[PDB]
């Protein structure tokens, strides 16, 4: 009943196209960051692109795999206390830690330790306020309160593949980190003729829109970047994959 000009239709089409371009760019950087402070080692490769490797210098003890004798599950949920292992994993970090960022599946297991459930209610022995009975459901990252010196946050972030979406973090992992920990969002110089002509190579994003010549002329919309997000100190964070 209320049509619109095809020119306006093209305008909104281009707006939507730019929006999805920006989303596609942003998810690449987010994947970069999760790989970087998830394991330190970070490689980028793909079709029509030579592989490139990035080693932050993370030590072995910062990527502890629980696999062993009493990793996490065979420990009785009744009497055992995970705080000792938390301290053990925190000490080999060389830096203050105040976040225990968590997976949306391993946090249930972490809560399953009734030691912390009783540690909640002491009235004189624990100021660590946790928020069970999740306070944010069907949404993005959710805080869970305070665990003394450290804040608990649970991530549900998903990145899309060619056709399928999947979680950033693995099934059951967690990472101890610092708010004050420094991370760089470096953007390389743009290797384009127009960019080098304009002197705009040092840019985070490079949007572009042109029209090809010839009678069947067609327009092309572009976004490009050279994201190289890194962090000065890999050893500040500690990554633990639960079992």
């Amino acid at each position: 009943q209320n049509l619109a000009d095809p020119a306006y239709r093209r305008r909104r089409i281009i707006m939507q196209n730019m929006r999805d371009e920006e989303l596609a760019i942003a998810q690449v950087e987010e994947m970069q960051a999760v790989s970087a402070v998830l394991k330190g080692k970070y490689t980028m490769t793909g079709e029509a692109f030579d592989p490139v490797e990035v080693d932050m210098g993370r030590s072995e003890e910062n990527n502890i795999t629980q696999s062993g004798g009493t990793e996490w599950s065979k420990r009785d949920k009744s009497t055992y206390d995970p705080t000792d292992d938390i301290e053990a994993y925190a000490l080999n970090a060389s830096g203050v830690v105040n976040i225990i960022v968590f997976d949306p599946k391993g946090w249930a297991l972490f809560r399953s330790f009734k030691a912390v459930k009783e540690k909640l209610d002491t009235r004189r022995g624990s100021n660590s306020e946790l928020e069970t009975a999740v306070k944010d459901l069907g949404k993005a990252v959710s805080y869970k309160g305070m665990y003394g010196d450290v804040a608990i946050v649970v991530y549900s972030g998903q990145y899309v593949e060619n056709g399928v979406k999947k979680n950033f973090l693995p099934d059951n992992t967690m990472v101890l980190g610092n708010t004050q920990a420094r991370g760089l969002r470096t953007y390389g110089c743009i290797q384009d003729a127009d960019a080098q002509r304009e002197g705009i190579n040092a840019s985070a994003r490079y949007p572009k829109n042109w029209v090809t010549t010839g009678d069947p002329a067609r327009e092309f919309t572009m976004i490009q970047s050279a994201p190289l997000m890194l962090l000065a100190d890999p050893d500040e964070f500690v990554s633990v994959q639960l079992a």
């Binding site: 793909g46 029509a48 593949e161 092309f220």
Partner: peptide, 18 residues
């Protein structure tokens, strides 16, 4: 997901959705 194509050659145009 955006691809890691090297800044030399080209890029396949992704379909417009809807």
């Amino acid at each position: 997901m955006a691809l890691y194509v090297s800044p030399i050659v080209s890029g396949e145009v992704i379909r417009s959705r809807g």
